[PDB]
Amino acid sequence: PELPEVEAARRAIEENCLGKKIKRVIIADDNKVIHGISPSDFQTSILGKTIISARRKGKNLWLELDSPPFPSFQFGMAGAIYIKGVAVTKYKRSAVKDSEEWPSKYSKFFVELDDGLELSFTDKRRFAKVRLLANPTSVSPISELGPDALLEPMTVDEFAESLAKKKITIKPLLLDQGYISGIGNWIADEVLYQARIHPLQTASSLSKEQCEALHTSIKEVIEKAVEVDADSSQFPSNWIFHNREKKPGKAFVDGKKIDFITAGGRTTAYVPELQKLYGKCVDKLAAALEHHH
Template sequence: MPELPEVEAARRAVELHCKGLICRASVADDTTVIEGMAPFDMQRRLVAKRIVAAHRKGKQLWLELDEPPSICFQFGMAGAVYVKGVKSTKYVRSAVKDEDEWPSKYSKVHLVLDTGVEMSFTDKRRFARVRLLQDPRLSPPISELGPDAYTELPDETTFADSVAKKKTAIKAVLLDQSFIAGIGNWIADEVLYQSRIHPEQPASTLTAIDCERLRGAIKEGKRSSSSLLAEGRLLMCRSCRSTMGFQRRRRHRGRNLSRGKWTTRTKWKKRRKPRQRRRLSPGRKNPWTTTGNLMVMTNQRGKGVQ
């Protein structure tokens, strides 16, 4: 699933390279992804319009046209924006190689601009949504989102007060897009680890210091990833300082934390036969505990967690 940095990288690619008059538009005949109108009608309303800006809130991306409506993209599980005509050294996930199929058979919206640049929004799993909205900020689902985790993060006092009102698990609170928009499953795991808070700890039991650490971890993730977006290196390991794109995240996170590599040993259960666990030496405590299918360090345990 695309995380917030990937959606922001797509927004920056479109903002820099895809401004111009739409000469030709092709919309897939997929009424599951194309929402609110017939694909042919959407295609007709896009032609001869000019893209003037690209905006984002949370994981929602929309292109502002010279006159309403705007075209909005909800990335879902596998949505992605690709730009033809941009060098592959820029925006690694968005660049298209000469040997690649174009447009992809999974393309849902394909736009050709008067500048010669072509843009395509693809979705292999059909969980994405494409809409035309008169005013995206005032229309669902964007109007139902909370403050953006990158650009509208509340101050310390407001953040702590908002968390204190929630009685559910803190990870569920972070994943609630009406609370903070843009934090997904993987980023939630990471910021909770960095702030040493157990994912299942009730949010109302967090102290002011816990909330300050949590907000700082979200802010630090924004700062470190923003400087690496343009090169496709979206994340930096806090221990070994190596940078990586989201394509490598699962492999990198699979390393053992005791060697100073990443936050969890494994997040998804393996289908192969598990290896026999080593027995701990007498008197030594197991530093790992399991919550759901996620293994976390015992120093993440908190109040209300069994």
């Protein structure tokens, strides 16, 4: 889950869960996912409270209850939000089909609300983190996050000045939640492809024109994916996203070949013909070997 998917879960929660009281709570017995608190303490703390709004920063979601502490959800690689109870919904990835077990055996956070509405956070891989904090934004991990790619976009000049001091290849920088928050593997590939920047290009080597192009592509990719509530089927056809998952040799975009470069455990789908690595030979070499650090 990257910013768009987590944001869609946030809006799905606000569609029917606001202003409703928590009548029953089930916090999973997972001392790996449920962090820093026992499930029974977690349950006792939020039972009886009303959900005022749903908030998000990067890939972290949290519920603003009528009074704190507030439950927060760090999605990890398989975290998901599911809402059952209201037949009609604008958020399909959060709907639950009758043939699905419910509550899911993967549920980590579950509450039954007024009007029989039930909300659940599930994690099949157990890489997610669920916390109950006095203020989610004051402590880790949310307090260590860089500005939200959607809610706090840097200006063109702020963006350029920050990149000038970053001495690392751009792909991993974009993934660093402490620099900018919310970008994951596919958004990174998409904005780099769109801006015509190679994943091994050092951020500090980017020219003023490159920074602006990247600034523009981050804006367009994030705004569009959110505009369509993370429904990839609605992603513009000219995005590398669609063929980014196809087997090597048969992956193309707008008719051009897609290759897959893997540096330091990170794989990037890019178009060699359109994304060139720039700079002196020894700097390009240092970037290709950067993973050694």
